[PDB]
Amino acid sequence: SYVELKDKVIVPGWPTLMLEIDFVGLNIPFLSVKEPLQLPREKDYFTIDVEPAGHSLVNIYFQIDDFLLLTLNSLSVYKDPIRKYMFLRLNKEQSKWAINAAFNVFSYRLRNIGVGPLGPDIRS
Amino acid sequence: HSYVELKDKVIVPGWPTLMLEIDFVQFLNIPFLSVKEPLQLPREKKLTDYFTIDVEPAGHSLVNIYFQIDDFLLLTLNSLSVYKDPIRKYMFLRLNKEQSKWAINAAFNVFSYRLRNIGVGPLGPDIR
Amino acid sequence: HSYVELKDKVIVPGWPTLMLEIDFVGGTSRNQFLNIPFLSVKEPLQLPREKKLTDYFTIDVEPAGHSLVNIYFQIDDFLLLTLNSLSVYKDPIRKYMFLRLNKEQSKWAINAAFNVFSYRLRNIGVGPLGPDIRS
Amino acid sequence: HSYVELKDKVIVPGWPTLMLEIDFVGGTSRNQFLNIPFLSVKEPLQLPREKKLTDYFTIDVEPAGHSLVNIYFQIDDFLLLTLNSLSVYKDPIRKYMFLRLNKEQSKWAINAAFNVFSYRLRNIGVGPLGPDIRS
Amino acid sequence: HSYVELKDKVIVPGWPTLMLEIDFVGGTSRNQFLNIPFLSVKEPLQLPREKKLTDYFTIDVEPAGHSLVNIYFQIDDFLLLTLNSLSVYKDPIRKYMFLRLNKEQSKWAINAAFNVFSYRLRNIGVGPLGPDIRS
Amino acid sequence: HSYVELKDKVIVPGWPTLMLEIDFVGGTSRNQFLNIPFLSVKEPLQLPREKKLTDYFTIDVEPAGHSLVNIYFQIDDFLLLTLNSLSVYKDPIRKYMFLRLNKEQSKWAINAAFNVFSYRLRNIGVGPLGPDIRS
Amino acid sequence: SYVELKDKVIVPGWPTLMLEIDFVGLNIPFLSVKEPLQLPREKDYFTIDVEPAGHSLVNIYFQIDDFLLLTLNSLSVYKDPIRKYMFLRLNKEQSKWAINAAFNVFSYRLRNIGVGPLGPDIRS
Amino acid sequence: HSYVELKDKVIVPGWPTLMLEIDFVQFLNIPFLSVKEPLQLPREKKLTDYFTIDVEPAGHSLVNIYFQIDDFLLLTLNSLSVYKDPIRKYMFLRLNKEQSKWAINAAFNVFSYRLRNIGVGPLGPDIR
Amino acid sequence: HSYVELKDKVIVPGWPTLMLEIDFVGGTSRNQFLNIPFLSVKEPLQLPREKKLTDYFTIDVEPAGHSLVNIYFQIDDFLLLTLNSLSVYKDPIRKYMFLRLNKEQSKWAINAAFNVFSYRLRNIGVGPLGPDIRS
Amino acid sequence: HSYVELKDKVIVPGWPTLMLEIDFVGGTSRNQFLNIPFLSVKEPLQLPREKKLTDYFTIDVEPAGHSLVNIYFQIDDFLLLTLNSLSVYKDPIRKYMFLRLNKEQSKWAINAAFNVFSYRLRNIGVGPLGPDIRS
Amino acid sequence: SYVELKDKVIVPGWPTLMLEIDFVGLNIPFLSVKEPLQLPREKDYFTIDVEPAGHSLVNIYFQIDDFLLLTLNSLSVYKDPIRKYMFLRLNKEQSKWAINAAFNVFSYRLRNIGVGPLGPDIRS
Amino acid sequence: HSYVELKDKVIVPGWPTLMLEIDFVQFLNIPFLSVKEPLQLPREKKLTDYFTIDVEPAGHSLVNIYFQIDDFLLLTLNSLSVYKDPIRKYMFLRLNKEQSKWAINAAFNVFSYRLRNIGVGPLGPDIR
């Protein structure tokens, strides 16, 4: 059964893990992390499934390997939020392109996004 | 006759979908219904003869799509449906803010519409 | 004077629609206009010969939030009366009113710095299920 | 150093406006621009001779969830006292604040990976019914 | 004065067409205009700098039956002469004239209560068989 | 009680108009409305205080063949004397008359199964050349 | 050979039999009747054929069974107008939709249409 | 050259049809000719190379479609025709009131046109 | 005064474009307009409330050859300054200038005998590769 | 009898224009017309009472390569002296000259097999900035 | 190898041989001639190939038979310009329709075009 | 990144062609590249996922089409190319005068684009 990866896993001021979905024919903040995620050079361990949840809503379902589950829980700012089976709810403005592509994913990736000038200061 | 709302519960993650696709006289794609298997009408017969739409405004910014679904399609969609028989003869869908805007700017004038089968994703079966 | 809201209830599905077409200074092309459903009417609005909406109707778009605008207007007496006579909902028009735009509609007003180029009236009828939708 | 929200109440229809204008490095379709009515003011804001806003006003766009983004800012004492003087709602500006982007604006911010190319602050005046709306 | 009919004979297939574009108050959208072929011409109508059709030409739509309208017009001297000089058919324009609309064209005039929003001139050339059609 | 045709001759260009306005229950595309110039009048028609037209004026739409439809009406004595007084063509109104719909109008009437939702009578004034056209 | 069902078979003030054609991808007054046509509960006996007759004209051809031929002749206001093989001429405004559907009929029916307030009075 | 009118006699009830279909730069469908059997040109060859149209106004409200039909198509249409060889090289069709209106509003500007086979109806043979 | 050329260098790929939309008297339809890229800008041009381009800007199309025209213009002080402040290229606008049209653009001006019907401003953003194209 | 080119220098922005207008027998899409600014003039050209231009002015369109075409002309003494008198650039008109068509114009000329149906010469005045442009 | 048929082969005032290409789904001045080309009654001896040469440019390649090569060289105003293998360069305005037809030629021909009123006079 | 111009040398007479076809929101056809053999991507895969365009003005009258070509397509086009490997990741094409005009009037707004194979002509082999 799939558990919701809630908004509280985003903590302003910290760096961000961004999910980035390229559709056939979209960035999503995934996890605030204590430091950048870096796999060893030249190395997926999570599946994504884009599914409709409404007349203009989409959810993203995740299957995350034990290996990446531990690395993410290690790196995460909020405490141990990552489970094996999860989902994110997109809002209508975000769901738009997923709907128009009929949920057909060309490619996805996970990127590190730094913090801006006032970064450490928002953390207090 | 009373127009019943086709609500979001009708879309169930992990199952194939019918997509309502509307062209104004630009292009709306709306997940209409989660179905257990696809939908494919008798030799060369067409949706539009079983399904009437009417776009009207519901306020200063929001718009509704009203529909009359004839008996043959009502029965078929209810059999295919994943959620418990949600199709009534007289229904409406609420368009979102952006979709409403394009409908208003088109003066509610539809060029064409259709229902299309959209298959499930990689983890679909598991999400069920 | 007091500016009273022209509320969404004034639009009644199943009836013809009096639309406000607003054209903003700037923009991309002539496909850019903001159409606002203004009032549901029993019959189309028709104006005296040689008159246009601008002869009876002053508008003013103003911000109401960080991504919201309102459209304020002053309606001359003749139009106020014609509009109350035509309205499906009982006599909703007052001299001084405003329409709340939503965030999608407001974007266009805000990006033009509230500067209206022109505006005019349109009458839109009802679709094939219209009588049925009224009941 | 906790950041206070600059809320909608600080925009008062009928009065001049200070507009915050942000453009991102990409993450936006071609003709989408980010303009935010920032503060209703009693009279225009003027900076002193050759002084770029970036000297008094710092911004940082950051995600607050999977969908929503806030714009955090640090305003120096000069501009703070000036804006609080010009403001219509009573002294709402603090040194450390944030402004909530709407869902659409948040998606452009997210798709731009929060990368700001430039920002600015502009005076926009009131419309023909402005003085009347105030009352 | 006597209003004389501008008859259909004044349109001569094979030649360029001076068109009257009429926009009525109300209506559905900006794709709604009534185009009337006005006169076949030897060359396009060109007007003096800064002048438009409305500076030389007053129109008045009036009903002529239960589903017929006529368009009456008064043509200023300069345009009357330019038009007779350009006309393919020999000198048909008089100061005071009317065009009979048919029942299809009249519908649009009638539904707007004869209220013209604006009007202007267009020049339309001849198609690939045009010279051949002249003979 | 034989019904007399109200013919086109009763519409005289240059003079004000009484417009008969009918809308059917369906049997019409969205933006098609049924407006019929009914009588040219020397001055506007006013009803007395709070008196709905349906009290003086009865209508019945009926087919006259496979394609054409007539609108039959019964006009009470007050309105008849009033319309005959205001009329420009000499006393053409009788108690029992019909009006022929055109082919298009007849098709909307036929497709609506002759079902009238409401009807009304409206004053429309004359255009800028009106007084001149009369003569 | 097919005989024209003329306009004189429509007599104002009387109730109407309406032919109603639904095209794939249109009401027509058919016959004025002395009283409503009612078949016995749960019960076609006429064929229609929509054929072009001009660059913007269509005709409707009818084959009517002996049974319905007699019932219609019984019910008709004008005297015994119904023959076995007939046609109606549509005008251009009526032919429009028949032409745009390439004469492809989804369904047809015959409906009773009452008369309005001034009904009996127009008959005199 | 003299342009001859293609009149309504050319459309004979009960037979298959060629439909002229015109798109302006909305959509005109015009029964063009009653044919004894369909029409289907040589491998991958196209009508437009044998058939030139020119829409022009004939008055303040009516419009005509003028056409030049090249020899190969002239012969073929005359062989297929039901009425006695009515196709000449230079002809015109009169558009109706509504069709005229859309032509005028399009400034006589055609995007595309074509000839399409349309089969007979149920009683067709009998009506012949 | 001296009319100085507003040269092509003033357009800088990668930045938003201030466009001049010009509508000529005559022509075929309302799809006929001549769009001229006028100046690349750091942000969209926004004008004061109730003002349009025509309130600050006079144009004059004149021939410069057998198939070339130039567009001359006089820019009022307020717009000159707003434009120099917005321009990507350093302060290019002077009070009196001209744009060279090429032979394709000139054709439309020439066929209208240089007679402008109306004109207005449009702001066009940058496409998906825009930031990258700037470098 | 060698033909001299009438070059672009003879068109001087800011001054009235004589326009050469040619239409071919076919070889042109419907709405393409051939207008050529011919000579800038200090004041309009008038012909004497009932005298068709063809009496003073002869033209011959001929190819000068696979792509380019010239318009050759023979101008009689009266018109030559008159045009040289009116001209702004000093006496540029000779008895035998040619004018180069541009690539587009040359293609219409080539596709029309150089067949001219008629030609004419028209006065076009100057725009609102005309006197100022001259200087 | 194909040789360019240059513009100098067009001499104003003389009559013209016009190449005329009709595209599937364009006139070109070919040769100024001393007198009209006329083949004997009821009688191609040249191939054309429309090829792209640029993002909006097309060239026309010619293969001309010995027979037509001699007749053309005989008739030509400029001296003996015709070789067996040649090409013409079109400009962008001329290339337009060739590009939009994807270089697919429905038919080509060679036509005689006379000279205008000032014809003999431009030759001097 | 520096945008390199795809110049006319890249089009070599006598060889098949790829045609860039652009639709604005009218229709541009541009010979893009001379290829030694056609181009035909893997089962049901689409150009648009390997190829980004951006139309921008370069002056008061001329317009450029800028493009980012992804690695898979870069390698394929360079292998097929007749001229010596001319495809770089970041390039631009100059539109002609007329093409520029339609781009400007469309406000640089592309509806769709594609690459199409166009075969050689009769004398093609010989011209090589």
Ligand SMILES: [Cl-]
């Ligand atoms: Cl208006």
Ligand SMILES: [Cl-]
């Ligand atoms: Cl974009």
Ligand SMILES: [Cl-]
């Ligand atoms: Cl005008």
Ligand SMILES: [Cl-]
């Ligand atoms: Cl409808």
Ligand SMILES: [Cl-]
């Ligand atoms: Cl403007």
Ligand SMILES: [Cl-]
């Ligand atoms: Cl054409």
